[PDB]
């Protein structure tokens, strides 16, 4: 309910987290000491071992105790505008475990990360002799997959086809409820993000030439259908055309991994704006998407240190 | 006789509107301590210090009640 | 030099003195027993030498609010009732008083004036030192502008005191003259602008120092309230229930000792901390901290 | 004399409307909070009724200045 | 009679209506909750409505002030 | 002689009305909710109508004192 | 004799006009949930148009105390 | 026959006044979701403005009340 | 003349003012999401400046009320 | 010549100016706080935040208009 | 006079300060915004600046307002 | 004649109820995030305790103008 | 003098804490703002203190009105 | 005395409880992003002490006000 006891907490999870010197330093060595600097920080309070397995269960285990309990501890209007930023993670289970009903490998098959929700509602959301009742033990009760399985559950039971509207609508839905309500630093936020996922759906659905406006959305601002089309198609222009806007360096970017990283790079600066908004949501958002970032960016050192790739191989991906 | 009702109207503004204040500030407090609670049972005493503390504003609107009283 | 004495200001009662003599003793007994302290409810484990300069600063309070738990005359907020041990004309039983604290006609222009004279000591002081520190390190804009401050602050006193206050506004024209000159040459001189919003905010922490007569009435007479409907209804009324209203205005003489001596002991150090500290600087760079070779022993 | 009874009572209702205004607007989000911890779970029943009814005092104190002036009237 | 009955009655309709806006403050945040508490599941109807019709005990007590101005009139 | 009649109609009005404020704001986030139930799903629709129909006891004791006020004119 | 005529109609202005902001702000945040339900798709209309003429019964009594006011006088 | 026609119509003036302001209060969130759900699509016309027009009741209400303290005037 | 003129000015004031509050809180909200649907695309000009100018029926009304007054005057 | 109409018209015309201040102040604070979002992100809307602003000064100049009328007619 | 002086100057202070409010209120949020875009970058510093001087034409207004009434006084 | 004790005394009762509510609408926010470091570590107490008891300024300096006026009644 | 000076005094003492109350409802917000802008670095100090003590233009013109009425007193 | 004395003391109280209210209006946002940067690291106390105390420039202006209001008397 109340924002600013939530920014209490986040400010001060905010207060602990890692330096720019860490990984500098961290950027040459051979992954002993990697696990020597990894045994101080917060991330070791559930490091068992060593290895790979045990360092991604503890980046996963310290993610869910430090990221997946501010979703709780408000109630209300605050938990229903902090709950649209981890809410990936709900859909890739949802969708894993959509595709495993239709598959016919076992419910004990997927791993299932935490989302936001409690696993008993995952053992408990697999037999349903309609899809419809799945969708209905799923639905806590504000929630947009709540909202959006049944709305495009109107057709059949369990297809394929149903997944590909089940990402749009859930697209599009994230989109209309960031714009259902008044936090001025995360409606902007939202459409920037789903702009830049169907930007990047474009570039990495070049060449095919099938229907883009059944896979185009809407909620972005930047974008709109003919540059999405124009953009399928192959002259980059148009991506040189895109300036005023944060899509600032990233012009003349024709593969994939370039693209996503100057995609992250530019959602991970205009997401460090919140701290312009200490007491609404921007604050929570800016230390998220961070957190995020930090994470992923703490897994890709460990890779390089456990394999002994070269620097050069990892100095483009610490650029922001 | 006629300012004896007056004193009286500032008796009650002044013990209505210190109220007042203190439920607005027991509002936001009193909602932290009831998720600080929901979060553990270990922070029960933090909760009600937190909580209890706003009272000097309606013992200081006693305090106005009782002089306008101790006068009449 | 000042916050003790300050303190001794807020609160005046002799009671209050005895039972803060009485925890300080008890908390010097606990440095004797070198035990640190330790409560898992506000989770504070400390060390005695800081329990031992807590002993200090005790000590050193309590001898303040002693001597003006006399210049006041107040024991135990109001147990002059039965033995009239201060000598006020409406019942002179004992020694005079110096102040009588309760009533306004009495005391609120004299304590108001005495209360704003300690804020103008304590502000002049502070913008003479950030003057001497500018002469100091040969920089020029921090000499400017304390003797702006100076200047500028000086020359609004004078028009209130003058224009606001009494007659004879003959003489501190001049200073008003004075005053203003300064400030003009020193933002001509200076071209360090936006001191002209600050010269208000700067009257402002000249002038907030009315809050040590203000808690000082509230909590005196507040004391003072409730030791009078205790006593009083106790005593006249039944004269055998008098330990009955003498231990519940006990108990909750008590309870506002511990719901408001928080706030008004937190009350002097604040106003020193955003007053005087905040005048000559203190808030640049941060400085840094001094830490040897340990040895943890 | 008149223009007493109706001013001490209109002091009466008052404060007494005015601190259950008090109460409304702290009960409002402390009961918030509190069936969201209910819905959370049913074990911390009793200390979100203890935190609800808290509040009390202030119309309890309500209802004494009431009952003061009425026994002055 | 006179003035004062009009200026006790104005007193009287001002603690009622007071109140009236105090425990409806009260009842909005509680009653938003429980409505998303009833939307989670069905099991926790008594809890929701004991949450919700414990602050009336405010407009019970405007009533007995109301009452008890009627009775000094 | 007498201004009686015209205070009492003040008193009245603005029990009526300040009572109606209290449960307009009560109602406001309760219907929010309650909507948002029913866009939901259907499943839960008499449970709204009595969640939002409930603070209506506000303006019922706010109609009883107008009338009581009524008939002691 | 020349207010007791002139009071009863800040009375009763201050009746209607106050409850008539008693269901604005009930009709805010429904009508707010309501067109976002409109906006989910066309077919919850009809509870949209219930929720919201549901808060008119407050302002349809202000207006019984108005008319009952004017049969006063 | 002092303040007979001035205290009328302030009583009119607070009338018209407070309804303009209650359904201010319904007309600012209910045309944000409207204008929200017309920069969504174009097809939402007819729904906004039936949900925004709706509450312009309130201050026909008013002005009803207006015109019969203009009538009695 | 006397004691009439000052109170129907101060009747006329009200109403202007509260009127003019009464579409300011409406504006703020429509002309926030106005201004929305303007910053994602051009094509709004034409939705936010009606809904924006809609709601200045409410002072027209009171510039009404305020004239009916004053030619009362 | 009034003895009691000189002070009440001013209060009258005071409350009206006053009270549509307010009015405008309350608009004009979401919409400036929107605008000024909009000019933030780009260079390019300037002139329609500008005339979403000063679109709700109708309230302030009837304001001075209802004041002024009750200074004609004092 | 007695009673002339004193309300022109309850009317000149009312108007001053309660223009005062409506242009604090205004302030609040755009200079939020304006800090906010200065945090950004020191690009938008004069636009920033235009915004938060543009609606002290409020408080021109209420001053320009208060020394008619002083010339008037 | 006889407008003195009361009027002084309701001056004294608004200062200290209005300052009391200044130092509430304070103390809620700041409390709220005081309790939002402490429950998180147990090492933010006295730097939480100091903001909280910051703003009991207010009700002294009400208090210190309730006093002088009870030195002039 | 009687009833002359009470009511200026009125005047220039609602002017002067209305005005205060309107760059306090400014001075949250800004303050808020600037308060994070320093937390994120400390190279913002001039900028938030530029925009923090703006609006106190407002208070100089409710001294400015208050001190006008106690040289007209 | 009369009504001189009785309305200059409320001229006081109600500038100083209202001024009171300003600065509890702006240091309540204002702490609670205090106690946020205070949160974060023991390192911005010298800054979030300075921009929380700005704000008492207001209620030492109401002081003001009152003790030239208590040396008119």
């Given at each position: 309910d109340d924002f600013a006891y939530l920014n209490a907490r986040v400010r001060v999870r905010r207060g602990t987290l890692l330096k720019e010197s860490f990984f500098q330093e961290a950027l040459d060595l051979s992954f002993a000491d990697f696990l020597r600097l990894l045994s101080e920080t917060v991330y070791g309070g559930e490091l068992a071992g060593q290895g790979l397995p045990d360092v991604d269960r503890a980046v996963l285990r310290t993610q869910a105790k430090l990221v997946g309990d501010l979703p709780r501890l408000v109630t209300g209007e605050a938990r229903e505008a902090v709950r649209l930023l981890l809410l990936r993670n709900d859909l890739h289970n949802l969708q894993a475990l959509l595709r495993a009903k239709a598959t016919g490998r076992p419910f004990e098959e997927v791993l299932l990360l935490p989302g936001t929700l409690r696993e008993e509602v995952w053992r408990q959301a697999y037999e349903a002799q309609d899809p419809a009742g799945m969708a209905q033990v799923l639905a806590v009760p504000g929630h947009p997959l709540a909202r959006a399985l049944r709305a495009v559950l109107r057709e059949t039971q369990d297809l394929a086809r149903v997944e590909a509207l089940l990402a749009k609508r859930f697209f599009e839905d994230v989109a209309k409820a960031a714009k259902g309500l008044d936090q001025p630093a995360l409606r902007d936020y939202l459409a920037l993000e789903v702009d830049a996922e169907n930007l990047r759906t474009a570039f990495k659905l070049q060449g095919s030439g099938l229907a883009p406006?059944?896979?185009?959305?809407?909620?972005?601002?930047?974008?709109?259908?003919?540059?999405?089309?124009?953009?399928?198609?192959?002259?980059?222009?148009?991506?040189?055309?895109?300036?005023?806007?944060?899509?600032?360096?990233?012009?003349?970017?024709?593969?994939?991994?370039?693209?996503?990283?100057?995609?992250?790079?530019?959602?991970?600066?205009?997401?460090?704006?919140?701290?312009?908004?200490?007491?609404?949501?921007?604050?929570?958002?800016?230390?998220?998407?961070?957190?995020?970032?930090?994470?992923?960016?703490?897994?890709?050192?460990?890779?390089?240190?456990?394999?002994?790739?070269?620097?050069?191989?990892?100095?483009?991906?610490?650029?922001? | 006789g006629l300012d004896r009702g007056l004193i009286a109207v500032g008796m009650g503004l002044a013990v209505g509107l210190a109220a007042l204040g203190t439920g607005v500030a027991q509002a936001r407090i009193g909602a932290a301590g009831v998720g600080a609670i929901a979060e553990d049972r270990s922070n029960f005493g933090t909760a009600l210090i937190f909580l209890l503390l706003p009272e000097t504003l309606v013992i200081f609107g006693l305090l106005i009640a009782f002089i306008l009283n101790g006068r009449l | 030099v000042f916050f003790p004495f300050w303190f001794g200001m807020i609160v005046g009662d002799i009671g209050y003195a005895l039972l803060f003599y009485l925890v300080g003793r008890w908390?010097?007994?606990?440095?004797?027993?070198?035990?640190?302290?330790?409560?898992?409810?506000?989770?504070?484990?400390?060390?005695?030498?800081?329990?031992?300069?807590?002993?200090?600063?005790?000590?050193?309070?309590?001898?303040?609010?002693?001597?003006?738990?006399?210049?006041?005359?107040?024991?135990?907020?109001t147990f002059l009732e039965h033995l009239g041990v201060f000598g006020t004309p409406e019942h002179p039983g004992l020694i005079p008083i110096l102040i009588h604290r309760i009533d306004t006609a009495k005391t609120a222009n004299l304590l108001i004036l005495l209360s704003v004279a300690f804020g103008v000591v304590l502000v002049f002081f502070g913008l003479a030192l950030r003057a001497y520190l500018g002469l100091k390190h040969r920089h020029m804009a921090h000499f400017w502008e304390g003797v702006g401050y100076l200047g500028g602050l000086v020359g609004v006193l004078a028009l209130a005191a003058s224009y606001l206050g009494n007659l004879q506004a003959g003489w501190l024209q001049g200073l008003m003259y004075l005053g203003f000159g300064v400030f003009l040459l020193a933002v001509l001189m200076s071209r360090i602008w936006l001191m002209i919003p600050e010269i208000f905010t700067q009257a402002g922490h000249i002038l907030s120092h009315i809050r040590i007569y203000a808690v000082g009435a509230a909590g005196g007479i507040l004391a003072g309230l409730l030791t009078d409907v205790g006593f009083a209804l106790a005593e006249r009324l039944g004269l055998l229930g008098v330990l009955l209203g003498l231990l519940v205005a006990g108990v909750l003489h008590l309870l506002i000792l511990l719901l408001t001596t928080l706030g008004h002991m937190l009350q002097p150090i604040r106003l020193l901390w955003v007053e005087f500290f905040t005048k000559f600087g203190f808030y640049e760079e941060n400085g840094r901290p001094y830490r040897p070779f340990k040895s943890v022993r």
């Open positions: 406006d059944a896979f185009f959305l809407k909620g972005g601002r930047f974008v709109d259908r003919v540059r999405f089309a124009r953009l399928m198609e192959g002259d980059y222009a148009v991506l040189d055309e895109l300036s005023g806007t944060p899509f600032s360096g990233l012009s003349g970017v024709r593969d994939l991994k370039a693209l996503e990283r100057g995609l992250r790079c530019v959602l991970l600066k205009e997401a460090k704006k919140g701290v312009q908004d200490p007491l609404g949501v921007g604050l929570v958002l800016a230390y998220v998407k961070e957190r995020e970032w930090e994470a992923v960016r703490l897994r890709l050192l460990a890779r390089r240190a456990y394999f002994g790739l070269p620097r050069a191989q990892v100095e483009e991906e610490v650029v922001c | - | 908390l010097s007994g606990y440095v004797k027993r070198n035990e640190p302290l330790v409560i898992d409810l506000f989770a504070l484990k400390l060390k005695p030498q800081v329990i031992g300069k807590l002993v200090h600063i005790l000590n050193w309070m309590v001898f303040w609010t002693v001597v003006w738990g006399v210049i006041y005359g107040e024991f135990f907020g």
